[PDB]
Amino acid sequence: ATLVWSDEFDGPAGSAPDPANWNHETGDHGWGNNELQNYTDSRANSALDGNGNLVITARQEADGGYTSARLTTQNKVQPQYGRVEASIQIPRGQGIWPAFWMLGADFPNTPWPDSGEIDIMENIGREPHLVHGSLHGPGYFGGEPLTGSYMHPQGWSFADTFHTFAVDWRPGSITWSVDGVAYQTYTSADTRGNPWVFDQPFFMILNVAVGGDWPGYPDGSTQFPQEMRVDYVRVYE
Ligand SMILES: [Ca+2]
Incomplete structure (x- = not known):
């Protein structure tokens, strides 16, 4: 193995994610899951913390609506296989839906789910001690992806600290790991x-959704603002 790319998120508090690596996706159209948030390019929703982390912040505004960020490496960093x-x-919180995932690099020239989707880590707030790893492709998508879950080995909340979420990926095979x-x-x-659609380059996505069909919606047990902190993203070949 060799580390071929990383973003270690070095830099002072409030700095922008490195545009050599990252794009901001924006909008509030539901993102295919009846999500509530408006993704923005504001430093209030994504910035470095000065402590070596990227922070994506999901916020509630005075009108009751939500903002967050969705960062991608499309056209900038496009891994194909490795770790x-x-x-x-x-x-944490009811209705909160953080994710680290990948979309096939031909999207949207090839539509979803034909483009492929690899979900490395998803969590929903009502399951603080569980993460899910999934594949979406033709005939196995949407409500019926290839999927499974991993519970924290002691049953604790993953939100308590940093954990390493990964896939190990080769032609015809993907393995999910936690720590x-x-x-x-x-x-x-x-x-x-059905066709296996993962033998091609993908780009990476980090986001925090607020609400959706799967997680459900924020309630009295949800405390805004909520942060997803990312110490690094690393790609090995
Ligand atoms: Ca770091």
């Missing part, structure tokens, strides 16, 4: 005769 990992301290512990592997044999 793709991030050290992340996830937020180095592999918990599932899906291969071309698991698609039930």
